[PDB]
Amino acid sequence: MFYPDPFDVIIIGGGHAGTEAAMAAARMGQQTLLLTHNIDTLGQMSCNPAIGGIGKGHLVKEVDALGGLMAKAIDQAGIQFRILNASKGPAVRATRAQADRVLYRQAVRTALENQPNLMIFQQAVEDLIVENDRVVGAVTQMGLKFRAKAVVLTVGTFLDGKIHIGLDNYSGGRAGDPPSIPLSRRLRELPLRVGRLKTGTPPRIDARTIDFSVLAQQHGDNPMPVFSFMGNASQHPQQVPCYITHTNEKTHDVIRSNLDRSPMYGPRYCPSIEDKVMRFADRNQHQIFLEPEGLTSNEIYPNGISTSLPFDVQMQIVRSMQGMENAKIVRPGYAIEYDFFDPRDLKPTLESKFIQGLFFAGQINGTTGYEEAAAQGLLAGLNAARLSADKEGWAPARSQAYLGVLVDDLCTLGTKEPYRMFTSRAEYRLMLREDNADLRLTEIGRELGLVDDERWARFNEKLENIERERQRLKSTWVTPSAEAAAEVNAHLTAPLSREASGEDLLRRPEMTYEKLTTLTPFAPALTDEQAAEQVEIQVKYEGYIARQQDEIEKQLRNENTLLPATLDYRQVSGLSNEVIAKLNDHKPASIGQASRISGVTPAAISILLVWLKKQGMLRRSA
Amino acid sequence: MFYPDPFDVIIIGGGHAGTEAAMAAARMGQQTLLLTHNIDTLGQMSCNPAIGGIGKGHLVKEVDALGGLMAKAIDQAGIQFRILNASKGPAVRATRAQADRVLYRQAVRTALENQPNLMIFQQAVEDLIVENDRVVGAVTQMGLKFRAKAVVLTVGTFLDGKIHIGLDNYSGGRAGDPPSIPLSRRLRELPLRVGRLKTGTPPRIDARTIDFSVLAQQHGDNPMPVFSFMGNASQHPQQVPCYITHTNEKTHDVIRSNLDRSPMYGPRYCPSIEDKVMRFADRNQHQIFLEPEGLTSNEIYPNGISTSLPFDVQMQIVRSMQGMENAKIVRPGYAIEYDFFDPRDLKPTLESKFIQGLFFAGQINGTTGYEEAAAQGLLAGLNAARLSADKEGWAPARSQAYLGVLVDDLCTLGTKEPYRMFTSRAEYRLMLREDNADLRLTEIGRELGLVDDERWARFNEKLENIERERQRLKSTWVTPSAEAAAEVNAHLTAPLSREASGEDLLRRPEMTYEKLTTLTPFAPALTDEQAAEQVEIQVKYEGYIARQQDEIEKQLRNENTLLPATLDYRQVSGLSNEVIAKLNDHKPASIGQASRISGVTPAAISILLVWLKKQGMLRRSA
Numbered sequence A, B: 001m002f003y004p005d006p007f008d009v010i011i012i013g014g015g016h017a018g019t020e021a022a023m024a025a026a027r028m029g030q031q032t033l034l035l036t037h038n039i040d041t042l043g044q045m046s047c048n049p050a051i052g053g054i055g056k057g058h059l060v061k062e063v064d065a066l067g068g069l070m071a072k073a074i075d076q077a078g079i080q081f082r083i084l085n086a087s088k089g090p091a092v093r094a095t096r097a098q099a100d101r102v103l104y105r106q107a108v109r110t111a112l113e114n115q116p117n118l119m120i121f122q123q124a125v126e127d128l129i130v131e132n133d134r135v136v137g138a139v140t141q142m143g144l145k146f147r148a149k150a151v152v153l154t155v156g157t158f159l160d161g162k163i164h165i166g167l168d169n170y171s172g173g174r175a176g177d178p179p180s181i182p183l184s185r186r187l188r189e190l191p192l193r194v195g196r197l198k199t200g201t202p203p204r205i206d207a208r209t210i211d212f213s214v215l216a217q218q219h220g221d222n223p224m225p226v227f228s229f230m231g232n233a234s235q236h237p238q239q240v241p242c243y244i245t246h247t248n249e250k251t252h253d254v255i256r257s258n259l260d261r262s263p264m265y266g267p268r269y270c271p272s273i274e275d276k277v278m279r280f281a282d283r284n285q286h287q288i289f290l291e292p293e294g295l296t297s298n299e300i301y302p303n304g305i306s307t308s309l310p311f312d313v314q315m316q317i318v319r320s321m322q323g324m325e326n327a328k329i330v331r332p333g334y335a336i337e338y339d340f341f342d343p344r345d346l347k348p349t350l351e352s353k354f355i356q357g358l359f360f361a362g363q364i365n366g367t368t369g370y371e372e373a374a375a376q377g378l379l380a381g382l383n384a385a386r387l388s389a390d391k392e393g394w395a396p397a398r399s400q401a402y403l404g405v406l407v408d409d410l411c412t413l414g415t416k417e418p419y420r421m422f423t424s425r426a427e428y429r430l431m432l433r434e435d436n437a438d439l440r441l442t443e444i445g446r447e448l449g450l451v452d453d454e455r456w457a458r459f460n461e462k463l464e465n466i467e468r469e470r471q472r473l474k475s476t477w478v479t480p481s482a483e484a485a486a487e488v489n490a491h492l493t494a495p496l497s498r499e500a501s502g503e504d505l506l507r508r509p510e511m512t513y514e515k516l517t518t519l520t521p522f523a524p525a526l527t528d529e530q531a532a533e534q535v536e537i538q539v540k541y542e543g544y545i546a547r548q549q550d551e552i553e554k555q556l557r558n559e560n561t562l563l564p565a566t567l568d569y570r571q572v573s574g575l576s577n578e579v580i581a582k583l584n585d586h587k588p589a590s591i592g593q594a595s596r597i598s599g600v601t602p603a604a605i606s607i608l609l610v611w612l613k614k615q616g617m618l619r620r621s622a
């Protein structure tokens, strides 16, 4: 029954969050155990085979900078690479990759399979062990049960999910996988409010039944970009293009005629296609993408045609488009409904506020998307390994990582939509960029021992280059009567009228970095342009960064002021009943986090501070 | 409900037999449809990751010579290659390959995914449609149902199987896959007797917890062999070795002490390890192999340590061996029990004798092993596509293919052991070799349109080379007083005493082919040694081949004499009651097949022939 070796941390579910948690825990020198249903599914993509995008590439970069694996399994599995918002400011760009599925799966499995201090095990779980608000050990299906000092759950969408097609349904975790039914009931016993969500995916087409000779082609950028701060372009496999098609009035007529057979007729947008037509009935054209699932299989994923209608309607819609006159379907589209926990009963370190040692990550946190689970799993594993070693935990803030924004929003949002990350959703966009993620996370990774020697050396060299470039550019001066100043005035507006300097010379918006590096002064730029772009970004954004920094420094006291979960707001005088109920329901962790809740005003926080001072629950508030 | 396109043949289950059936049906110019649970499992190996062996390589060669895929997916996925019985006669050699699992899976999937006239579909089946002893169409789970003129079942071990560990059990098709329960009941309604069998597999070890520094290594053959008659050695990936270890008295003591916890305490041999110790208690040493599952994963398959004991005993046995003092297990060992049909109610063309158009192949035919299913599936698909096109079927005999022997034995054996192919199990070993499989099957493949142009050209060139070599060796003559005969007599015993010839010169057993080719006469041999070995084999085995040929030619009349399944042997005078019951139970297809049944004597067949002549059910018997 009892396994004769105790472990530090046990992860349940090796999906997109479990793998990151296991890697983070093992790399931090703690004995890690990973339980999963079945192997060869590690790194499986059950949806659009794409990585990154607007708001998703930032999470990938954050995971990579802190010692992740998603950014490294994509450099050897991407069949198309593009940069989004390339023409706009550098703070908003993103990198999106159409990925070969098998190469990604194998990269993930091989990287995870050779990780020291970690062991994997293929078995389901059926219950957990808890006594005195402490979780210790998990129970498998055969009868063998383990013991550990910390447990992380990354079930995802397998918590008692049903596949829905048309008006019919059947049990299933996803297309071809079984459901984890009993664990849903066992967790329902725990003091966690549980709800249900539903999302769908479209069918798959056969590439050798589509006449691509009349379909428009789309390509990526000529210089293929990279995700990780370590690899280069020599690791990418061969490239393939994408095909673009549209719909026509016959498809809309068929959808409207057969709209009766649907469970519906809901997010604030339109995920399906019948929603697309009904919400906007005047539009008569839509864009559909066809992209290959890999460079060695002829299955085409159609993007933009997701629905929940029965099979006949699906076939008619597929067969009523240009270039799809005679098409075959290998995998029917379908939706799935799964359980989740409301993210208002766990600490910002992704630990349940009621149980000691229990952590949550992945889809069960009311989110969606590959990138939205890797960061959660990595942080959960980090905190679990810190706790098992008896050291204080860690959690990022809204001003240093998109992960902090994600956690804070999931804690104090209260909406019902699946959580999708967007660039504008964070209030510190101007500094929470992609190229500087390592510069703001790798030192923390090193302090907690999540970064090995190669990354440390690379970052030290990059920082040295940045500092030397800054100093050398600060060490130049020019005058209007300078011997070489004629050409400087020729191709620069507003010619020099007084003592000039490169640090001030570049302040003009029209000038760039490489242009200044090509000059009689301002000697040739450093060979590592990756470090060179940093100085340009800093010089262009210095004023806004300074303003935001002195803004952030002011809320630090409210950030530090913690509120224990045992607090009973009914024992506070001067607060309205609605505010009391709201604060009792949310149970924030800090006064600043409470202030971010909708419905609380500065008067409420002032009264709360007075009450805290009265009860002595705060050392000081300055 | 009804799919708007009728197909020629529908295969249910894309495993090891379904893929071959689909390829054979599609390559024969018939619209083929393949239903499966889930994709990315095509080509999965759920047991020892090895291909070929004694009696299994012959089936692989037969499949390859007739247009198969197993022999082509192994040349790009094998990590170790060896020849068994290399020192013995060429008629008994075999080729065995330790294979990388992922490369095999991807080769299979990519080869199957680009097959013209074939389409794949991911869906389970829940029932079949039959009227008036005819099967037309199958029903899926969602509700969509198809129509076809022929149906082939390749379920394998998913027909309502249970996983067993120790004294506990749970539903499962295998480690990580769901069971197909309702189809088992639906097939129970069909007039086919059903039974249950059980077989197990050992656990998996972690390669980075085993001290291989004190373990013996094993190697293959430097001159690499080849499976397919098309590829070469340039397609094989990098090679890896295998490790060898043993057991000791502590393991036996632990097994004996904890023998109580076992469902048992059965094939005529000992599949498990506790059986190994109990059946032969005097032996105190056993051989265990450790082989890598691939060149990119550190999971080690242990061969020779299969069992059904609980997990604690498994761990003790693993930890009580040299080099395994501190070992980890990633996948526990387990057994499975599954349903099957008794192979006495189907025609030799793998068609049920009662239903029209229904075919059986794979594990459901009471067999085991990868190679034992591919041939069955290929033949079933061939016959189904022939039937759907309204042409006479085909079935090999015992004298031209191991498939004929396999089918004949499964029809008229009556034992309970899982059927494993062995070289000595066939009575025509001397001609049913491996190197000549194409020479005896590719012409039939071409006649039925299973062979494309490349194989046809290669075989035509090879046959031309063989014929020219035969003629040129027949066109030589030597004399004792020959000018170059001094050396001939020097290195050959019994010097020439009369007119000599190479066709007679090579008749000496000590002489070889290459030695004769490197002589004053008998100019250098042809560059294609693959064709050169054929003449050596023919000249060495001519007498035995001639004897066996004139033997086989005599039973052809009994082979041709068919016996309809509607025959009622109770209406025959002069036959004993036991013989009547036996023949009614078996219901053979030919008088020769009936004679191969145990318990029938020549008197019975003579009386049967007399009765047939009386009733006029035979045109003639000569």
Ligand SMILES: Cc1cc2nc3c(=O)[nH]c(=O)nc-3n(C[C@H](O)[C@H](O)[C@H](O)COP(=O)(O)OP(=O)(O)OC[C@H]3O[C@@H](n4cnc5c(N)ncnc54)[C@H](O)[C@@H]3O)c2cc1C
Residues within 6 Å of the ligand: A012, A013, A014, A015, A016, A017, A018, A035, A036, A037, A038, A041, A042, A045, A046, A047, A123, A124, A125, A154, A155, A156, A157, A158, A174, A175, A180, A183, A199, A200, A201, A334, A335, A336, A361, A362, A363, A364, A368, A369, A370, A373
């Ligand atoms: C029908 C469908 C629709 C989708 N729609 C969208 C969409 O609209 N937008 C979008 O962004 N993404 C969508 N997706 C993708 C989805 O968000 C991701 O595929 C996935 O849910 C996120 O990964 P995860 O790690 O959070 O969960 P999963 O990948 O589901 O995690 C499950 C993994 O953990 C293992 N596991 C789980 N529970 C256990 C347990 N108890 N014991 C052991 N092992 C366990 C499983 O074996 C598996 O490896 C969709 C997917 C499907 C199938």
Ligand SMILES: Cc1cc2nc3c(=O)[nH]c(=O)nc-3n(C[C@H](O)[C@H](O)[C@H](O)COP(=O)(O)OP(=O)(O)OC[C@H]3O[C@@H](n4cnc5c(N)ncnc54)[C@H](O)[C@@H]3O)c2cc1C
Residues within 6 Å of the ligand: B012, B013, B014, B015, B016, B017, B018, B035, B036, B037, B038, B041, B046, B047, B123, B124, B125, B154, B155, B156, B157, B158, B173, B174, B175, B180, B183, B199, B200, B201, B334, B335, B336, B362, B363, B368, B369, B370, B373
């Ligand atoms: C516990 C265990 C022990 C084993 N022991 C041995 C051993 O001792 N010796 C040995 O040689 N082999 C052993 N094996 C391997 C196995 O017995 C066979 O060697 C081999 O797997 C045969 O596979 P198959 O293709 O015939 O069928 P399977 O792999 O069992 O299934 C065939 C395929 O058809 C699909 N399918 C089935 N039903 C349907 C349906 N209704 N609709 C759609 N698709 C369907 C399945 O999903 C699968 O992909 C063992 C396997 C297990 C799990």
